[PDB]
Amino acid sequence: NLYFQSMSVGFIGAGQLAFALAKGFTAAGVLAAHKIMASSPDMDLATVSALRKMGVKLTPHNKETVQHSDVLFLAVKPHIIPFILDEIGADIEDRHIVVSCAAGVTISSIEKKLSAFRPAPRVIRCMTNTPVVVREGATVYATGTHAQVEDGRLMEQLLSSVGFCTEVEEDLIDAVTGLSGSGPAYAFTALDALADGGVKMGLPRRLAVRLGAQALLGAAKMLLHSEQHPGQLKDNVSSPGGATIHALHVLESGGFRSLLINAVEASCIRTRELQSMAD
Amino acid sequence: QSMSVGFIGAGQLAFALAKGFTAAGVLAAHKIMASSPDMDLATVSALRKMGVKLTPHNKETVQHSDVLFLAVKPHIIPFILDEIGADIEDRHIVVSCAAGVTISSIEKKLSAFRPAPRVIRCMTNTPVVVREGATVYATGTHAQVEDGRLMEQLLSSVGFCTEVEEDLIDAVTGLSGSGPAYAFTALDALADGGVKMGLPRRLAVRLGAQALLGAAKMLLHSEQHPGQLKDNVSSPGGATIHALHVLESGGFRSLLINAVEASCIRTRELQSMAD
Amino acid sequence: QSMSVGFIGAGQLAFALAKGFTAAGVLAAHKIMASSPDMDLATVSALRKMGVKLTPHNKETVQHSDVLFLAVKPHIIPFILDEIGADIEDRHIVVSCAAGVTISSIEKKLSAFRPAPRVIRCMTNTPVVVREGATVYATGTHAQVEDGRLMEQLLSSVGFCTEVEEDLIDAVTGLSGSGPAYAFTALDALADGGVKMGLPRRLAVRLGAQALLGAAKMLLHSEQHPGQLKDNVSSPGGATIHALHVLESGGFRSLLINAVEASCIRTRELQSMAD
Amino acid sequence: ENLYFQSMSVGFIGAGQLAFALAKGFTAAGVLAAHKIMASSPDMDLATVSALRKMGVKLTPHNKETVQHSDVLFLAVKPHIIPFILDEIGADIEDRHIVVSCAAGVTISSIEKKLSAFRPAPRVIRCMTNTPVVVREGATVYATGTHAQVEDGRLMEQLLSSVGFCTEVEEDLIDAVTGLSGSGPAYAFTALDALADGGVKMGLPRRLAVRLGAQALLGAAKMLLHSEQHPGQLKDNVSSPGGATIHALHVLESGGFRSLLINAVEASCIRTRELQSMAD
Amino acid sequence: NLYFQSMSVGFIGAGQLAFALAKGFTAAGVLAAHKIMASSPDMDLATVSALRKMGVKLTPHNKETVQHSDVLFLAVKPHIIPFILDEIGADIEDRHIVVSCAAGVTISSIEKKLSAFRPAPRVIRCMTNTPVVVREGATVYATGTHAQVEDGRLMEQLLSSVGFCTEVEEDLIDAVTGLSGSGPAYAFTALDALADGGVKMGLPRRLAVRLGAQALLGAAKMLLHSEQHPGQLKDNVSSPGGATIHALHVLESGGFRSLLINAVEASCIRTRELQSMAD
């Protein structure tokens, strides 16, 4: 029964993430789509037409988004962020909470840009993912220097309506990016390959896609609802001598575990080095 | 269009572009001049048979042309610019085709002679010779708006053409600039596979090339993801899905990623040595 | 040509062939009938919009057609033949498109009903949908000479078409039958490489597809070996030769050979289980 | 021919593999009398030195004697010795001399820098050849230095053409040539040993396997040199569909055979560059 | 000063091998092209037009080749051989020496086919290669049951004019096929790759091809003219610490030697299994 009656939400950027969050927020009932405004440099975007069908207010002018909004999501790619902050920095007011969703971009760098216009900007950095579109996102956030205690509780309230949300120290966020920020892409890759496996063994493609995704969803839910180690759940499922343990062996023989460690590492490191040359 | 075109360089790219332009009918061969440091080249004799004017003097090409293509290798561009920079006039549009060479470096060399050189950077590929090239271009500091439109009109006649930001061109080089070479390697290997399985070489080459051509045309005319088109074609339990698995087991996908990356990085690396 | 064509099967291949035939203008949609065990298929609704007649009864397709394409999966052919064999008349030409299924097995099933069935075996691919398919065919024991000419005239309108000995068709399956799937995988990976290097996905997909299309067209229009065209495009020390090296270091060539082989062998393996 | 009647005196600083190979090639071609060649070595107990003496080549421990004897002076020592050599005999280089450096990596600039401290216009040529000059099938390239006369490059080309292929290149190509034809014979000897092992594994006597493999590679190289055809086209021509040869080519591709040879050319070239960088 | 004045040579098949041998034989002066006849099922072949320019007599009818010839080369692919022997078997006479160049096909199988028509057919099996076209072929031969001692000496005389030639036991020929029969293809592959290496390091392609081929030719000639082991010649060329030994290491690290052993083995085994299903 949550609803933010006095909150105007704006999205700088009207791409995948802004659509996913707006869809999630409105599906959760916590915001009315007409109380959301999004701005985009290209109004001929599929996500822009989708946001328009929802009822979200759309504008080409970032300044209009800022003037309309209380909570302002920077739903743009990391290299776009400093241009956004140069453009609208003079329009930030006391009432604004600026929530950056861009990978790598530090609170420090945002505060430095905005503080040249107005001292004490209220900044929150988050890392979320596109499954907020089905209210199963994974979100972490860190509060900035001048964010009030109410600002982080508010943002946790809002972001918890579309998935898991928790506060973290800012120095964990690049690693979260490599795990849950990039994670859905790993899963989509795995599901495409699992479906190829089912097709190779004779399943129709549509059934193999449905079954693979359902297996992954159910297993993740089993882990989330269990107090047990993922190795224990794996043990419970592998009958001695059986089909599953034979398949687990061929995964081990290819270094399956190491590839996923490799992926989280590679995404984290790339996130860190993008900001290093930004800074 | 009364327009005169010149090529500094008379090698593979100048031949491919002149053949495509004249086949498209956007240009008559007699409105094209090319220049080369070696006039005994196979490409030079071919350009002559088509009716292109030829000269050993880069300066004559400059004085002939309105649109001047620099169709030489990247390390030769600075020599060309020092040689012909004093001859560049207001009317000229200088189109650099060299991998890696930035608009900035070209404008700097030419501005020492005349203040506002009109410079366009492109990356094309040799399939322009059959009017199926892939071309991107970026407009320079002093390029007029009609200059980029003229360029896109010309290059669209021999393939795909679009304007990009200059910072995308090195990556495009790794994808469509080097791309034909990846395809030629793949077609040779596919034919070897057909021959291993019993096909005559001539038939295996033709079938493999036709398969890649048709598949690429399907994707271009489809709104569908290439994985969806792959799914459509993989009968459960069948021959195609068995072959896809052995490609996956070799990391086929990663090798093509590796190649785009290596070409792009080498392109950037060569320009860093230039500057 | 007053000719009536039928498709047993209303899936990907029947759609692709009907779309190509009618786009070529060799056939009007109203002269084509297709039949399917499931009438709620996307391909079936598409065929309907084009103007193809549709029916759930294979027998109605047989009675409509002069040329009857069997556009079903290999394991379904024997069921089709038992269902419709009593309906095959002297006028019919039965064209099997199924991978692996031999003319011998088809003639044996149909000869139990009428003595001299006219049977043609082909292997085509779905790029017929954009009139760039690759097709081979072999004529059966009772096929008239005009039957193979009619077939080649029809299939040449939607791509490359040539007659082969039947013992080449399983290998052709591994090359051009599965080939588009290899290309779709390669194009997805090439686009990933372009995206890794900074390109937007939409542009990377377009450039990669255009590069493969143009390269394949170059090879088809060239008398030159694909290694020569590769040599022409590899500037010494440059980006392209660096990328070719990383392809070679992965055994890129061997993976494509592996794929043709695996598809061919699986095709042969499926027919051995049939017989 | 006319080179012989020119009665050129030739010197090698170095009495090793290359000096033997070039001396043997030059004398077999009849361009030089063995006794018009002089070679110097710091180690006169080498096997190549005993072979040079048997040929009738003059041997001396003093590099100065080689220089004073010579009209054309080959620097046939390992790269790291060259700067020591130029210090020692630089005062003895005369205007009549052509100095031909054979050392991998060593630039004309570094040679001219040393020699120019003595006479102002040393005539320097840089070359990269290989040991098959010994059977007059060498692969040689050369680049002419700042003060090499046009006739010096022609004389060099005439002389090195008597023992194999010879062509002028820009100097910036020579390190890559080193990785390809300079080291190339060692790649071939490795390949011939392995092909012989393969013949022996399949039941052939070693002597026959060695002879057949070497003849195969000789005939194939000659076929290509005399062909107007791409090597892939010649490969296509001899790969019968479904046959033995295409099956064997597949197992070569599966091991990345092509990439290993590219790796080798690159490694030799890169090592050649880094040896010169350590020197300078 | 060799010349076979009373010998009529015929080629069944007018492909790569028949062209290579005819070119080699005429270049060696040992045969006049007009005393050679070749037959082909497809007279629109590049090799057929080439043979016609040489002056070789061309015919579509294998029976005409047989009637014209004393020495009859079966220059056809192995699966074609039994059809040739069925076609012309009744035309073989006492005067004929039948020389099969097909991989895998045994003397025994040829003699069985021809003996149904006429007893004691004179059969020689050889394995040669296309470098006979530049008179540097590598040829082995085995004499059949009814071949006279003069027949093998004659064939050695003829085949020695276009390269190395020696008699072997028939049971070595499949292995020779994997070594020198397929060997030129290995070399063409190696030369293409070596040229790619030179191009990568900055050489023009034409120069890199010329230099690589010259290196391979010179090294093979060095080995043929030396009494020394190929490892010794390799030792003589690798200076301590130098460019060549560095390159040899990267070949060893990739298992270079094992790939060539793999190739000879694979070609030999495929040759044996082609004949096994033939027989």
Ligand SMILES: O=C(O)c1cccc(C(=O)N2CCOC3(CCCC3)C2)c1
């Ligand atoms: O061979 C296997 O790995 C396997 C895979 C799937 C199902 C089963 C099977 O037969 N099941 C009956 C009851 O117990 C099970 C749950 C834990 C293991 C067995 C499911 C076994």
Ligand SMILES: O=C(O)c1cccc(C(=O)N2CCOC3(CCCC3)C2)c1
């Ligand atoms: O570094 C490379 O490999 C590369 C890749 C793409 C383009 C170019 C480049 O600069 N080009 C201008 C001169 O003509 C060319 C046609 C083929 C070779 C050269 C294209 C070089």
Ligand SMILES: O=C(O)c1cccc(C(=O)N2CCOC3(CCCC3)C2)c1
């Ligand atoms: O075993 C396979 O993978 C395969 C490969 C090529 C062709 C066919 C085959 O029999 N076809 C008739 C039915 O429609 C098709 C279009 C795409 C799937 C089926 C082609 C199957």
Ligand SMILES: O=C(O)c1cccc(C(=O)N2CCOC3(CCCC3)C2)c1
């Ligand atoms: O199975 C193979 O790969 C193979 C290997 C060696 C020899 C032959 C063979 O039978 N030959 C008869 C005539 O033509 C040939 C030269 C070009 C291909 C065929 C030699 C076939």
Ligand SMILES: O=C(O)c1cccc(C(=O)N2CCOC3(CCCC3)C2)c1
């Ligand atoms: O670094 C290497 O491997 C290498 C490669 C090519 C040439 C040379 C070089 O400088 N040479 C001068 C005289 O001795 C040589 C013959 C045997 C080894 C050295 C050629 C060294």
